[PDB]
Design a protein around this ligand. Structure first.
Ligand SMILES: [Cl-]
Ligand SMILES: [Cl-]
Ligand SMILES: [Cl-]
Ligand SMILES: [Cl-]
Ligand SMILES: [Cl-]
Ligand SMILES: [Cl-]
Ligand SMILES: [Cl-]
Ligand code: NA
Length: 129
């Protein structure tokens, strides 16, 4: 599914991501924009052989099982395929675990490089929330 901007902001708020660990909804929308372009079916293979999955490009080294990332963990206790669903529940629940890990949203390199310290409230401007 390719979400609209305000459609995704609303879905993330419905699942309790707004201000989760102190991160406003515009931070999450911005991270999803640059990670996936709001496409739940986004995938990216890393040099190390891990794969990033879904709207927030969650990685197989720690967070989900794909059966093809040697030595990896599955801390969200999900198949990585669950992160590609039209329903963002699995992505949101796993994102809450990642952002609680100690480095906040710096876990998402694209958030640190493209969203951090920007006017992220622009990402929810105009949305009926
Ligand atoms: Cl957009
Ligand atoms: Cl915001
Ligand atoms: Cl594996
Ligand atoms: Cl595990
Ligand atoms: Cl599995
Ligand atoms: Cl949803
Ligand atoms: Cl933090
Ligand atoms: Na894994």
């Amino acid at each position: 599914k390719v979400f609209g901007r305000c459609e995704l902001a609303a879905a993330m708020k419905r699942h309790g991501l707004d201000n989760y660990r102190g991160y406003s909804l515009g931070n999450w929308v911005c991270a999803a924009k640059f990670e996936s372009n709001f496409n739940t079916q986004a995938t990216n293979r890393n040099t190390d052989g891990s794969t990033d999955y879904g709207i927030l490009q969650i990685n197989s080294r720690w967070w989900c099982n794909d059966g093809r990332t040697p030595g990896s963990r599955n801390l969200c206790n999900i198949p990585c395929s669950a992160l590609l669903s039209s329903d963002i529940t699995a992505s949101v629940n796993c994102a809450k675990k990642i952002v609680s890990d100690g480095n906040g949203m710096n876990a998402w390199v694209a958030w640190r490089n493209r969203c951090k310290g920007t006017d992220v409230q622009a990402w929810i401007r105009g949305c009926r929330l």
